[PDB]
């Protein structure tokens, strides 16, 4: 929150805080209409800007905010994890029921697409990748990898049953390990950042 003087240069009007700078901007106790953030404190400063008409005193005030994750957890991170679990539960069904696991996989993909659409519409239209975008991308990768792996398992049926059994037993336990390590590294790098 930068404020200064319009029409009065530094040699005419100067600003200053009336009390100690740490105690000048005072936020009330019940004065918080924030729903998504958390006000941590204030921070004042004073400087000079060099414009086309002269130098002007500018008083700066920074309010430090920290976003609360409780909404986005239930909105995106709980549906992504639950949808990934719903994709991974298909590996426990037998290889002889192919339409069942097929509609499992494809409707899990459908859930991921509508989830990504509903979760992308909250954040403004930025032109880079955020952490939620990376999470949705990796979860989509896991779900799609589960479905393509199932397609591979089904394709290997009626020609090589031992290979399909081996790769379905290996992918019945390799998927939770990779998903858990990804969760650990992601939350560790984005909570300690």
């Amino acid at each position, epitope marked *: 929150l930068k404020f200064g003087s319009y029409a009065y240069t530094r040699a005419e009007v*100067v600003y200053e805080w009336t009390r*100690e*700078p*740490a105690r000048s901007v005072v936020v009330a106790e019940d004065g918080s209409r924030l729903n998504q953030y958390d006000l941590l404190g204030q*921070t004042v*400063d*004073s400087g000079i800007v060099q414009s086309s008409t002269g130098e002007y005193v500018v008083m700066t005030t920074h309010f430090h905010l920290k976003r609360k994750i409780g909404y986005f957890v239930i909105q995106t991170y709980l549906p992504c994890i639950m949808t990934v679990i719903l994709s991974q539960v298909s590996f426990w069904l037998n290889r002889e029921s192919v339409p069942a696991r097929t509609v499992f996989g494809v409707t899990t993909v459908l859930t991921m697409t509508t989830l990504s659409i509903s979760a992308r519409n909250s954040l403004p239209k930025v032109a880079y990748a955020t952490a939620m975008d990376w999470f949705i991308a990796v979860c989509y990768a896991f779900v799609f990898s589960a479905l393509i792996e199932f397609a591979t398992v089904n394709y290997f049926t009626k020609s090589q049953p031992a290979r399909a059994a081996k790769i379905d037993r290996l992918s019945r336990i390799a998927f939770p390990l990779l998903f858990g390590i990804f969760n650990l590294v992601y939350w560790a790098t984005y909570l300690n950042r």
Partner: antibody
Amino acid sequence: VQLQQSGAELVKPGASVKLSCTASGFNIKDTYMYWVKQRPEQGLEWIGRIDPANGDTKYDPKFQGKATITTDTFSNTAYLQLSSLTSEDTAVYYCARKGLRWAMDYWGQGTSVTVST
Amino acid sequence: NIVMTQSPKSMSMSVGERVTLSCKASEYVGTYVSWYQQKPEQSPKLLIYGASNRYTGVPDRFTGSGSATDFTLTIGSVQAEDLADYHCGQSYSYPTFGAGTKLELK
């Protein structure tokens, strides 16, 4: 413009002292007035400040209750009273005023109190 | 209570050379760090008010450099009257000063 302090004091540990700082060249109701102490061959230490236009005073937590700062507007004077001073606060006491970017631009001349028997 | 740590505690230097003094704050002090000069048996004189602003009557060889926590005071062509103590003090909160730096001639 100028701050003038009183002379040195030679008091006994356990009594009270009153130092004065008279301002010439400005009205003390426009700025703050600071009291600083400096021990022999050491760094400065802020005692407290007073807002003469209001009367609000603030003190250092290690000086709350010991020192008390008052002001006299009619003669443009700032007073520092130490209540019960022991055998270690034998320092030089400076009187300062706040400046442009909240700095102490004008300082007094120093009052070197000495406690002994 | 914001503590200001000044370095070095004591130094020696010859005439006509650049010298740099440093002040480090524990907490955030925006640009409200001031540098005072105190000759022996005299009251301190304000040299630099705010971060990088010279006071009226200070030569053009003193200049300050500010940040959120790290502050420097650099002198250029140093003459023979800068044999004094230099204190840094913050004014973002209730003022606290640094320990001081004693410049000497050698």
